[PDB]
Amino acid sequence: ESDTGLWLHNKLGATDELWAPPSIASLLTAAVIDNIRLCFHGLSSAVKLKLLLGTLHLPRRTVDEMKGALMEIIQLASLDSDPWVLMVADILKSFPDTGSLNLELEEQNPNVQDILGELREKVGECEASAMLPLECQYLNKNALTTLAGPLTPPVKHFQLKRKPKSATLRAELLQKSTETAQQ
Amino acid sequence: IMEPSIFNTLGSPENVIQLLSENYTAVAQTVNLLAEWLIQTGPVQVQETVENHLKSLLIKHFDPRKADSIFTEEGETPAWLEQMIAHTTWRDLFYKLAEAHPDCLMLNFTVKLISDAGYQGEITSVSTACQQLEVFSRVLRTSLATILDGGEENLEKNLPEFAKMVCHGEHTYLFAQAMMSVLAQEEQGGSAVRRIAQEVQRFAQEKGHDASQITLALGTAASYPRACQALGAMLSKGALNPADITVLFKMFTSMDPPPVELIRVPAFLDLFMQSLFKPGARINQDHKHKYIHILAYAASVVETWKKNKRVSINKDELKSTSKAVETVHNLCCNENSELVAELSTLYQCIRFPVVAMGVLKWVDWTVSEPRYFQLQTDHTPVHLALLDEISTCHQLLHPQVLQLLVKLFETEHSQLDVMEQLELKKTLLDRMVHLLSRGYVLPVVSYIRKCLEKLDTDISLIRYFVTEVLDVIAPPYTSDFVQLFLPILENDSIAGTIPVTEFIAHCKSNF
Amino acid sequence: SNRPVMGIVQDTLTAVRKFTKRDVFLERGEVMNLLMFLSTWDGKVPQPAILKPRPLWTGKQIFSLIIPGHINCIRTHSTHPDDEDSGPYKHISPGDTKVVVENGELIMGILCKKSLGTSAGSLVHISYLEMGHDITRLFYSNIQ
Amino acid sequence: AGILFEDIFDVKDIDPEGKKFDRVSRLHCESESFKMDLILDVNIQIYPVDLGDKFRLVIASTLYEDGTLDDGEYNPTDDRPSRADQFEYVMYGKVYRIEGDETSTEAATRLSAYVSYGGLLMRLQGDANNLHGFEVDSRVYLLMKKLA
Amino acid sequence: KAFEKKFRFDYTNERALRRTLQEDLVKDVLSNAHIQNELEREFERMREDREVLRVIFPTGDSKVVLPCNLLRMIWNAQKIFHINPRLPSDLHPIKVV
Structure with a gap:
């Protein structure tokens, strides 16, 4: 870092992409984030978001031993002016502690409360009729029934007059399988 | 002009002649006259074409500059x-005008008011929604309500317009992974919204989006450094490195259970699916035993999560699923034929659910390989009979079974003879009708309706489909099913060529 | 068939493929020896591709000297992947398999039958079309 | 002073697609002063570049400090000084294509400069202003020295 | 749509046309009704040529055998005259017509 503000303004100041690069981990060393203590408010909204979103990629052991600096950085983000930064800061306020995030908004952004509220009964009204998690596809019958309740059976769109042709060929592969196995 | 005419109590003399041109003369009189005249000539279309004529002239204005x-x-x-x-x-129009010049105080300030004033569903809001908090939360509420009442089919329709909004940046993604996670953590319908969350995570995995760092901390799986650090390298790298599997094996086996949802992540189990069920994956004995143990552990145990305590474990069904996965592993890796001889136990393994998508992926990596149908000689290949049994035993894999099967149906095998190409298509249609008897009705017939009405596939295959369907089904019929099926027979490119009388007799009674 | 009837063959073709590879670096004396088998050479030794640590020329420079005037060509090497022209590195070949001659200079690419044989649009074909016949005769002889 | 480009580069890749050539390895390098991606093909067989090496890359149209132009002819017995004296890897070539993110009515802000050194290619992507000196069909010298 | 986008000269977008041409040529193209009419007539003539080609080749192969290689000739003209593609040109489109 020749000048930290300008250097992050080149690396994370690309207005074209708000992505975070895979090389961000080498950029976010302790010697870099330590220098951002002095000059953080003058930095733009996009660089602040990309920097805070870069905290996720760092592993647990390289963060928790030095959690205080991150706690100070997110506290400095708690006083910011961009609402996106403010809300993620109030969400990421417990990331470097153990990784168990705040996972609730009842102190900032009063308008999202009605967003939660209007979906809160609608989700209950359409509990199992909406969709079933992909994890339960692999889980057995007892595990699926205990996890998300019993399966919803198919609607009887029609009756049947005789079995399809697949039954005969399935029986034929069974009888062939047994004779070839015994032979 | 209308304004530059008599500026003073005359006011230029040239502008007084310009006033005669417009004023309350032809420019105004004939406007009402021709507004009633084009109406009387034919007409509600007149005001619509009038508005179109205004709208074309509106777009020239320089709104972002003066405002x-x-x-x-x-x-x-x-x-x-x-x-x-x-x-x-x-x-x-205002949405279109905003896209021309973003990053402006006036436009982003004004759009916050129209979103809640009647435009609850903000169309074409791919980028404009990202900038403003209120509009993003509002359209998210509309999106989550729409997907919740849409059912199952709409998930294909709901994915692209909604999930692409978080592609501009990650800040729009973790927030879009926050409130619905709170809705998922509750016992009141918490499964379906975590389902769409994991679906969004999987789309992120196939669009290159990094979702390996946020979903682990969101399911409170970050409570242990070893578990989070172990799983992070697996999901980030995308491989089964032995160190993380060994620590997980010695961890979960002890009397200290991690959260069950971390080992049940669909991206992790799909990664196991890809790593293990591939025919070309060669693993030693010990690591294979640990892999099959992890899958069995991830698919057998029932646990009571009281948020501080949990005392529950099952070992027998873990052993049974370990045996099934191991035997199917042996069949998949050996590859040699003696394949037909192994169906005595293979269908027993088909009865287990965790194996069904394993053999499904194995079949996908087998049949998609070219010349496989050319190399095959049976009237019905054994792999497709395995998918018939998969369709019979279970119903959760039916979207995936149909997706693989239409992927095969649309495929062209140029190396094959034309008549065997048709007989292969008829075999795939035999799987269609088999799956129709197993409850997957509407998506299959929707595929057929698309393939016939819009596309130009062979009409013989459609005729074979309709004949098999009519010969296999019997009344009563639901109104949606007859609503979907009836336009096929009314196309008249099929009806004159050959159940039909019974169906047309019953349908008119139905509707 | 409106294509050149005669082209570079056998020993010259294999050796020019081995010569135009990106890894071929010629010492000074080797460059001196090769430069004087050029009948169309202007006598000015080109600046080396690598100046330091050691002066090394590449076979592309020498073949640029062989190619006459300012003919322009794009040709595709036999081992060229198809997907290379779709993804990144499309115009900076990791395999050096895209042949482009600009201002009569082989800026990149490895030469084969597709660019020096009898096929239409090859280097000898456009050399004949743009520079008459005697210049192309000298081109053939200089290559060999 | 004839310098079109100057930077300190770090390299974290060595032939990601695989070893295409024994004597040349593609170098995916990343800048440390600005935002700038460099793809480079070097002669490792005489100048071995290990992973994580710090090297100062300079693009100059003339090696000579005074700025007099070079004729593109080898002249080892030259008596003038050069910028090649302080740097330990110098290689000369031309630039065959400049690309950017320009639209029909917006300027390119992310330029790309494809430069070929006798068949050894180099691509230099990044911001337009630092690349603004590069122009097509111009001979340049790739100057490099390895830092610590 | 692609043919119109890639082959019809547009004299209504001042910004992009100023990007690709010198300002005096921009003024001459915009002011003249005659030049714009001639350019549109050329476009309609090449549209007629397009439908004639579609009549001639019902199979959609564009490969034909014609005397002068125009693409290589334009490349040669670019290289000989040291054409800078980044800069705007001094070539009047009506001169091309």
């Missing part, structure tokens, strides 16, 4: 814009 310096807008522009946004073509 920035005012900084006030007299209190949210009540004089002219507030009545304007209530007009359909104008409010739709």
